[PDB]
Amino acid sequence: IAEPTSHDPDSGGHFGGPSGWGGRYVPEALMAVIEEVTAAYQKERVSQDFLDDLDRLQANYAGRPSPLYEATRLSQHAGSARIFLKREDLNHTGSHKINNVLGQALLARRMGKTRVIAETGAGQHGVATATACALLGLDCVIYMGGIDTARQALNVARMRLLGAEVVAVQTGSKTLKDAINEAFRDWVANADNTYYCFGTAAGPHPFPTMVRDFQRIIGMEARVQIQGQAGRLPDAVVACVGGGSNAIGIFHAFLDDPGVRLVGFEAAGDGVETGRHAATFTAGSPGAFHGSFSYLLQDEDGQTIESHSISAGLDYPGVGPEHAWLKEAGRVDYRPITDSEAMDAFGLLCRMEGIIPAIESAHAVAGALKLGVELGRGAVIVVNLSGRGDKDVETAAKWFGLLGN
């Protein structure tokens, strides 16, 4: 069943007013394919055949529903609060990102598109896209920065094993935000048969809403599971915030719940005062970027500032527009977490629960511990464990001196 649209933007994609957050800050050369994707998505989001196809893939292929685990051995470090982990790390491919690429790849098939392009930071979303494209017979082309391709040799081969093609972006700063620019240029040239599978809850309309909808299953499951295991709605739901897809996916089911705090944690890198960070809400300002009006890290002239984070998934200068709306409206608080706080939580979750989290997810775990101290004994905090940390083992081992020299 199609869930209601109480928090949707207007027909122009604007949140909280006709000149609010979101919209479409794209060239006219792209509006034809965006209106086509928007019309296709509005038809399929209410098609029971589409929701059945997606449910069938989420259940038997992706492994949904993911469990809700109460990390009892973390309570001592969270002010004796009760930490519940939404185990998106157990999804196929190992992150929440599989929820996004399954719906969009199904949508690309419904539209008759035969070619799918996508960006990726250090490889996580490119692997996810290539996975769905293999499953549904779609041709796949992944754009990746030349710095990241040289540093992530195994993820490139992982994508080639799945039948996808990897293109190294050697322009600009040669990282995530420049792979998006190259994928955007590819779409302008090949919109006739190509679908752009965007990897987070940002970009022009309808992508912030569409990506959010494909991730809302996280919050829908968690809201039922937390009531079964705790007997009540939680005192807080938290998640890490890069572009915002995994956070908005678990946040959405709790928006109309009056007493449920919503806290997103962003990457502060070396510290928000050091200039080597990615704390978009904490140290950024509003502006138009990557097709939406939202928050981004920018200097006095409006130029994009390079972001830094020990995690690759939170290393992004912008953030989705629906999060900016929820911040302005006071529904969600956004707080920073440093590299050290996250790695401290990374190792704690390893020693205490045997769960190796993604470093992106470790930011949310770290903030949950801090929030548990603030909320006190007996507080019920739901944490979106957005991914597993098998990809981050080499980074964590160097951090804790497990590799030497």
């Binding site: 122009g12 006709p18 509006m31 009006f293 002239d301 994009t304």
Partner: protein, 249 residues
């Protein structure tokens, strides 16, 4: 009331030619050198100058403009350097519009940027990533400070969006692109009499002449940056060839 660029195309049409529209990004190689090159364009027969504001993430720019704007930002170019270039072009007896992505304008302040640009002698604004759907603030500021608003149309534009974009444009409409460019101009001229400028990777005099058959203005940008990288003598030479191409008789 008539647009700021209106009389320029009227004069070009009376002399049986198209307007030559030249683009150069501010601050490449440095700010003084780019100002000298923009001045040379006026001296060499450019009817309209496009003053490009270098942006850190220019998705619509080709590799030549992208490498030139990267180098200009490495040199520390500022948005105010573009307003100074517009002053210099006005002083040199030229006509300048500013092509820029919308975030620098939002950062500067939309009404503030329209005011300061109009004061600096600017005539209009080309907005490659601002469609009319998001242009409410820009429409109000362009009417306040009498600035032309050049939106873009594309071969893939729907008939509804094309008419809405042409209706929302003042000065001229930018047609960005085998036979797609003449067909695009025919679609615009089928619903309005507004001048149409065509950018098509123009690189020689013969290409400018082909476009001048059906378009009111020929837009050259990437080829000018390449010539400036060689030097001002090469840029003056190329601009003279392009000025000869737009003239049909």
């Amino acid at each position: 009331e008539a647009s700021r660029l209106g009389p320029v195309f009227d004069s070009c049409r009376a002399n049986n030619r198209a307007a030559l529209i030249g683009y150069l990004p501010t601050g490449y190689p440095d700010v003084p050198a780019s100002v000298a090159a923009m001045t040379a364009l006026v001296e060499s027969g450019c009817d309209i100058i496009e003053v490009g504001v270098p942006y850190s993430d220019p998705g619509m720019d080709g590799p030549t403009i992208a490498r030139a704007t990267e180098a200009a930002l490495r040199g520390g170019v500022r948005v105010r350097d573009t307003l100074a270039a517009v002053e210099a072009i006005s002083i040199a007896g030229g006509r300048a519009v500013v092509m820029t992505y919308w975030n620098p304008v939002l950062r500067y302040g939309v009404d503030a940027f329209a005011r300061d640009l109009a004061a600096a002698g600017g005539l209009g604004l080309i907005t490659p990533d601002l469609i009319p759907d998001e242009a409410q603030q820009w429409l109000a500021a362009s009417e306040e400070h009498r600035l032309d608003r050049i939106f873009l149309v594309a071969p893939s534009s729907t008939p509804e969006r094309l008419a809405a974009t042409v209706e929302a444009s003042r000065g001229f409409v930018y047609a960005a692109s085998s036979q797609a460019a003449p067909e695009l101009v025919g679609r615009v001229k089928a619903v309005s009499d507004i001048p149409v400028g065509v950018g098509l990777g123009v690189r020689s005099r013969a290409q400018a002449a082909q476009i001048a058959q059906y378009a009111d203005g020929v837009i050259v940008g990437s080829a000018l940056v390449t010539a400036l990288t060689e030097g001002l003598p090469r840029l003056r030479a190329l601009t003279g060839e392009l000025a000869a191409g737009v003239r049909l008789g």
